[PDB]
């Protein structure tokens, strides 16, 4: 009683797959971050009376993220680990895979349960969107794409914007990408701090 819900993946990336700088973001984009929470906390209208979205991250990722923003705000957190230690926790889930992350979440938040989860994101580290790809409900793609060969030394781990994944992932139409994501989103090159970049959604069948 898991494999119900799919996953989504969301990610900034360059142009080479960049994500990643002395851990942490190699650009500072403030409506690009807008756009990353408002995507990852929206509900609809009718079920966010009681349902909350699921950010899944890897530890580094948790480290990453300045203190003043940890948990993630209105989103339920949960850092994967192979190290049942102590992020001392506000509330603070831990698993150690994303398998592990699914069973803890259905389990905690049950039919029953007074919060209920809507939406269930990865949304980063390198090391934890490579088991994301290699799960076999992942099948969207929430990706940023930054236009500038920006100097990065953490890569997004699949090409999947490349030829040799073509077949398996595809490229939706704007139109799409706003239902899915419920609001008005710009279409097209945005610039903010000297790079241009643009949102885009993708997909794979399961
Ligand atoms: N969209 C963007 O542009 C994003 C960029 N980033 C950047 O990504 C970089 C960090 O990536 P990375 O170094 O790969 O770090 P991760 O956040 O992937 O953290 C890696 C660690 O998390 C745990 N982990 C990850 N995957 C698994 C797994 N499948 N099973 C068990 N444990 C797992 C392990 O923790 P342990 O060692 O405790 O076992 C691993 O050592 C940083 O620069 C950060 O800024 C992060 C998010 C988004
Ligand atoms: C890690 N991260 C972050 C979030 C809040 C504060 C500092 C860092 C972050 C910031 N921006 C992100 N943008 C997208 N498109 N996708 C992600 N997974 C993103 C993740």
Redesign the pocket.
């Given at each position: 009683m898991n494999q119900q819900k799919s996953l989504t993946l969301?990610?900034?990336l360059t142009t080479s797959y960049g994500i990643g700088r002395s851990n942490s973001?190699p650009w500072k984009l403030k409506k690009?971050?807008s756009?990353?929470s408002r995507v990852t906390s929206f509900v609809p209208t009718f079920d966010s009376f009681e349902s909350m979205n699921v950010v899944l991250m890897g530890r580094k990722?948790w480290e990453?993220?300045?203190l003043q923003?940890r948990p993630?705000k209105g989103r339920i957190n949960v850092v994967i680990t192979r190290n049942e230690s102590l992020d001392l926790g506000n509330g603070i889930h831990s698993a150690k895979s994303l398998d592990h992350a699914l069973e803890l979440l259905y389990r905690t938040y049950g039919s029953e349960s007074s919060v209920q989860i809507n939406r269930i994101f990865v949304?980063?580290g390198a090391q934890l969107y490579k088991a994301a790809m290699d799960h076999p409900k992942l099948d969207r793609i929430?990706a940023?794409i930054i236009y500038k060969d920006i100097h990065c030394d953490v890569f997004f781990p699949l090409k999947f914007r490349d030829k040799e994944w073509s077949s398996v992932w595809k490229k939706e139409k704007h139109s799409d990408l706003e239902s899915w994501v419920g609001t008005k989103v710009p279409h097209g090159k945005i610039n903010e701090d000297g790079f241009d970049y643009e949102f885009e959604m993708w997909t794979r069948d399961l």
């Open positions: 969301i990610v900034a973001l690009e971050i756009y990353f990722t990453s993220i300045p923003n993630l949304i980063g929430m940023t």
